[PDB]
Amino acid sequence: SKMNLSEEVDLEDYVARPDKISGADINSICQESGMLAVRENRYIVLAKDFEKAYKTVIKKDEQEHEFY
Amino acid sequence: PGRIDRKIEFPPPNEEARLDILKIHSRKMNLTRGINLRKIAELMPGASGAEVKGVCTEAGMYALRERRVHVTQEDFEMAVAKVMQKDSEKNMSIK
Amino acid sequence: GFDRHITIFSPEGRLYQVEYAFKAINQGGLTSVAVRGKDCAVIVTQKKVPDKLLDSSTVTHLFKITENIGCVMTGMTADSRSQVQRARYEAANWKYKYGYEIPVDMLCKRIADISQVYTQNAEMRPLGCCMILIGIDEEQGPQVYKCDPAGYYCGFKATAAGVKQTESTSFLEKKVKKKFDWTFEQTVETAITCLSTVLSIDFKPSEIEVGVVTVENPKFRILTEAEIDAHLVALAE
Amino acid sequence: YDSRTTIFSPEGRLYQVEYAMEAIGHAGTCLGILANDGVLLAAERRNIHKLLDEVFFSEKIYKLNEDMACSVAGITSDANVLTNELRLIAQRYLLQYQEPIPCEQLVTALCDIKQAYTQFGGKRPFGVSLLYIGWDKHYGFQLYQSDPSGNYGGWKATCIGNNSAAAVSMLKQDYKEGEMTLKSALALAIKVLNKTMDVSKLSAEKVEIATLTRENGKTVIRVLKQKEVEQLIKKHEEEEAKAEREK
Amino acid sequence: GLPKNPDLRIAQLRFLLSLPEHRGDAAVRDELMAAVRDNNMAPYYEALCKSLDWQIDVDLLNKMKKANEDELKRLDEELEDAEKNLGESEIRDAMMAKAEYLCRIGDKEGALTAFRKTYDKTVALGHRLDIVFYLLRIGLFYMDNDLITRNTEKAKSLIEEGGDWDRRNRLKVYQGLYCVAIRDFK
Amino acid sequence: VQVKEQSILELGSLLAKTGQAAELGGLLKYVRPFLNSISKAKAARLVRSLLDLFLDMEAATGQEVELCLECIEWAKSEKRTFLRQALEARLVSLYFDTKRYQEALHLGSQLLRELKKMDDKALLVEVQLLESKTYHALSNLPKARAALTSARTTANAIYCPPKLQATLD
Amino acid sequence: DVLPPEADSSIMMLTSDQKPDVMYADIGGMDIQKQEVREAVELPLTHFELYKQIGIDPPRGVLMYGPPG
Amino acid sequence: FSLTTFSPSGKLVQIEYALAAVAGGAPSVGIKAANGVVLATEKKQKSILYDERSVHKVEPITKHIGLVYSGMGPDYRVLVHRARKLAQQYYLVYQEPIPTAQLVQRVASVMQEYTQSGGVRPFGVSLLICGWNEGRPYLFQSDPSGAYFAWKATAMGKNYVNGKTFLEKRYNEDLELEDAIHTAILTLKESFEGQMTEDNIEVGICNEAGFRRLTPTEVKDYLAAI
């Protein structure tokens, strides 16, 4: 929201999928991912930009189903 | 040698000791006319003089948000709640 | 220490041995996809065959546990075969003790209980193989379940396991969120395109082995080369 | 491979058993006082969270036999199994001899099982010490205290809880044998419990007490309910007020 | 600090009845409604100028004043004779009760005497602040600009220097001196 | 046995559709035995729905406040604290709708004092938002900003209140 | 002579005041606690007078032993 | 060694780690009302791929004994299977007592094979039990090492502390009717991150008529008007 709706982000981008990662991703990484909407091929940001932002600089940690 | 002279130990303060520490720490501060500091200290289970200091400063901070010179018994009991937040967390109670 | 060496609870309040055993499934270099459909349930895994001196006839990772339940294994092949043998024994023993055939959910529950006994105690170790078993169940339609080296047995509609399981699960989540039921053409094509998008080799109809259980046709059909080739031709059309 | 510690010390000490016995002092608080025509136990209710319902009707005091009752002060996991084994031993004796089991024999059996647990195998010592009050044909009212070391002792006024030293000092100061009766024993027990529990004016809910009395050829083990306990508290409070004011 | 505020109201009502003769019908009504209450006989030497010399409540009202003042005087005599409480003791608040009786009931002269007495007696921070506040309030009551200036001078000079977060409780009436005077500009 | 309350809901729906006021008021004053015979939450929400439907269309400004105050007093007599708190929040909203100056403010303050000791969240967010709204109506910008910031701090709890999130934004 | 300025002697940042970079409530971290931090700003937010009279001793140091989170 | 073990001087370190593990993240609140008991829990499945009618968090051990749990679901399965076998054995031995609440205390006590024989690694699940075949309800909690606690209202999730605080502040109380399930859902709401729905929230109720796991229809009905 700081960058007004990620500089006019599209509707079909919601963070519900790329936030419920349980992969740390400190607020600094969150700000970096927000600024990784710098893909200026278009004037709007899509869910692909967020997916690439989460894909870069990340460590694979998963498997909560055993604990639950 | 260097320790065989004495081995004096510190008993944790009793309810009346916690009284006396409440009186020592609250003589400097201002509060309401009426307060049952004896029951206030007894309400705290065990604890120590550091916890009495924590209760006194918690009462001061609680009275700060209301901005009055007379710390009320309700604010004191809110300060007694500083003895809480430790408890035993989960009811282990295994003994 | 030995918190991370034996099956004991960590001081932080975790179980590291099973956490490692799950990554053991990713080890081995394989992926599998399971898609439940409107009426059928189809599963497909790649068939990584290094050199042709092997017998592609017997390199498979999918098996018939009983006449209506088919499993696909992911992870170390020795533990995979051990758990397949255990599942077949459980299915036969259930059919002997109780007249009706063992429901797939009950079979997955028993396998998960065995795995939970394995993660219990300290003499043995958990088996590094995650099993996805499917089968048609009356009054339930197709049914898909996953038992893991921990003992948590669940999984439905679209579920994947292997190295690149997360990407496949994401694509299948997109597909299932797209509200349209898959017939006995769309379910297979969806699974095939999911695994192909995960690992783009365009899937020459020899490197995957698909198992199918429909409702009008029961039994675990291990679809032949001709059937997978026909489905691939229809999809890439 | 990991191996347990059921071994000695370079000096020759069983420091695992010693640590367990000291840990028994930590957590829990029970005391038994023996008097003529009645023996009683007093227990400190540790957790008094308002969200409980108190339906087990007893947590520390356990009825173990027709003619006896115990009170644990160790880890509840071992306490439950130890109470079950104690009841089983008592009832096995009752089956074998068709006669209530003498208290000393029961305590010796239990301490034998605890000595076995600390003696052989890679098994933890039973981290629990419990009192016993009971009546028999040979010795009448008896009180026994057994520690996790398995070395029981035949007491007449003792405490086993956290401030067990303070409680036993208070008992020694204000204990009088022979003259002691059931009512004066109740007064002494409530007084020592008030001493060992820092909060004065103890609520009847935080204290659980059970008295064993000898009716006409029959042993009655009555746990004193809330109203009777708080009436005892009121009588004690009257005594305290009179004694303090008369100076 | 609530006392002397309803006194301020009656002082303003006396102003409205006295200075503007246009308000000579409703002003009489409000003056009477707030003077038959509040025990206005000692604070009626000022009220006699506008209305009659004394309203028709003389017997009952004077009996109430004398009885109340005598009871407080008896209480003060007991504290100052039977008990030797000195300095930091309850005699300080006993004389505050004396001053409150002499102010809210009696005339300003006895209240001022009791105030100046305990001001010279005890110089504690809280006691000194309270009495300075009372002196300011009674001064702005009876329109003694000399007393208002005196208490304002001492408060702003030394009294408010010792003790904080109470100047915020006092400037609203400490600047009333400028408010009542011409200096309403800066 | 619950078909009667279904009929009450059905009657209230038709009264709202037609626009009736006196009949709906009489029904609300009549259903009180049935309210004190069922689940507290279900009866409370039925009362809230009926009251909101009554206050929707027919603008009897001299009767709406009095009727709802009577309902609050009735709820207090029935010791339904969460019901009476909900109607207090509703009258804070109605007060803001009718441009009430400060009686809305102290009612909101009373609600906040009663509710912060509890741990309700939806009511707190609505109360704080209404307090921000009336500060803005009275042009109390800094206190509105402080109340709105507290509204955000409280509103973090509810994850998908699709109406409420739009109200905050 | 004595040089008045002290900050730029070794740089090490300077007066970051009088400049809104990230105001306050605009932070995404909400609180974490932020109540001990508002407690820490009580001394800058005047209240040194209220530190006395009431008798409290306001904190002087605040150490935050957290990761870049 | 091969039992509940690892007890140093004055501590049960392995048990304490098991309790750190049962902190979990499934709140699984329980409320003992006058008419009966409500055990409500949160089923927050990862993604929509998983199913909610496939696996359950609430299990009816017998006719009117219901069970909810905490972290380590695989352990909870074995524990509930053992509990079912134990209750069935008791009912077979003492034939036809319709044993639920005169058995709820007994089944809670026989939850000693639960932990007092830990099995090298102790169980990592704490479970709440409800029964109402005595004319009165019963809510008990068994933890990875302790025993019956006989709660009136509690939670065993990631935010169980503030959940229990909510329960006491909202006055679990004693006159509350059977429909304190609204308060249980509210307590879950505090420890819930999302728009909870019928499949997202699983709740079972045990009243004097028996025990029943509420279907998504009634769960959604209760979740409506909240």
Ligand SMILES: Nc1ncnc2c1ncn2[C@@H]1O[C@H](COP(=O)(O)OP(=O)(O)O)[C@@H](O)[C@H]1O
């Ligand atoms: N609203 C926000 N909430 C939390 N963190 C933010 C916000 N906006 C920016 N940040 C990030 O916080 C980071 C601060 O990191 P840094 O100062 O390096 O950590 P540390 O203080 O531990 O060294 C910045 O890099 C910035 O990207």
